[PDB]
Design a protein around this nucleic acid. Structure first.
Ligand SMILES: [K+]
Ligand SMILES: [K+]
Ligand SMILES: [Mg+2]
Ligand SMILES: [Mg+2]
Ligand SMILES: [Mg+2]
Ligand SMILES: [Mg+2]
Length: 222
RNA sequence: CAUGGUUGUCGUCAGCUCGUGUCGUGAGAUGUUGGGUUAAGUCCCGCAACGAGCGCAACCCUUAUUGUUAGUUGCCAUCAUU
């Protein structure tokens, strides 16, 4: 990935100065118009390191979980994870998604069961009220667990856009010792992320560019 | 004031909890709170929770309309009679 490609996508824009994390100075180039400008020279080095790291993860056949619920990130991380063949969370992270995995599976299992009825003919002999109700129930589960519905186990790596926003996802990863690859903004804490990518979290073309490379890495490694 | 069973009572009020997860040194907390809504912990949305059980509701009885089957010991519209 090119330094101009990052610049065109606006990967350099940080947050307002007063809202920074002091630990991010290591990745900041300068400040402009009241905002911190990320150092793209290190961004290229770090995104390449993440690219190889994600690849080496896929080579093992391990699972990757793309987490991002930001408005800017929600559409991309869905597309790329499906594109890469991996699993994603893009609407809302459920507390216990991974730490409470056993209980969560009973809900993913429910989704499979209700999908079966539709492809089994039970909905044809249902008294309207049930089928309408179970359709709503299926819709909610797909709303939440659809992106991970087919995840075979707890992921070997988690990719997070705006880890500051995705606070619970970072906590569930630390608990389970799942390394995190994240786009880290000027306001985010880098010490919680094993593979840092200093990047803007608030520009769609910025999230699309970085997410695509990480998704491609999993395509290439597998 | 040793008990089983049975009963009143708050009160047909809406609640009472559990499993797993998470927070807390700990007792505990979370869920069950919040924004709406409902007769209702009723439902929806939001949420470090995700689900489940006992309750709520429904399934039961009666009452209000009606088709059909039945027509005596019930009934008398169309008939003659008392
Ligand atoms: K508990
Ligand atoms: K009848
Ligand atoms: Mg209560
Ligand atoms: Mg209830
Ligand atoms: Mg709630
Ligand atoms: Mg009842």
């Amino acid at each position: 990935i090119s330094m101009k490609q990052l610049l065109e996508a606006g990967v350099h824009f940080g947050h307002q100065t007063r809202r920074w994390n002091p630990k991010m100075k290591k990745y900041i180039f300068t400040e402009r118009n009241g905002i911190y400008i990320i150092d793209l020279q290190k961004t290229v080095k770090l995104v390449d390191a993440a690219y190889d790291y994600m690849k080496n993860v896929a080579e093992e056949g391990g699972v990757a979980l793309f987490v991002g619920t930001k408005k800017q990130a929600q559409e991309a991380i869905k597309d790329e994870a499906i594109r890469a063949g991996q699993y994603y969370v893009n609407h809302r992270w459920l507390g216990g998604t991974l730490t409470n995995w056993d209980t969560i599976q009973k809900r993913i299992a429910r989704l499979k069961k209700i999908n079966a009825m539709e492809e089994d003919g039970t909905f044809e002999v249902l008294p309207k009220k049930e089928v309408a109700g179970l359709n709503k129930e299926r819709e909610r589960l797909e709303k939440f667990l659809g992106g991970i519905a087919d995840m075979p186990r707890i992921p070997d790596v988690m990719y997070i856009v705006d880890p500051r926003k995705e606070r619970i996802a970072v906590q569930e990863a630390h608990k389970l010792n799942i390394p995190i690859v994240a786009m880290v903004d000027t306001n985010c804490d880098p010490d919680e992320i094993d593979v840092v990518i200093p990047s803007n979290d608030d520009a769609i073309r910025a999230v699309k560019l970085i997410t695509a490379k990480m998704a491609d890495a999993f395509i290439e490694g597998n």
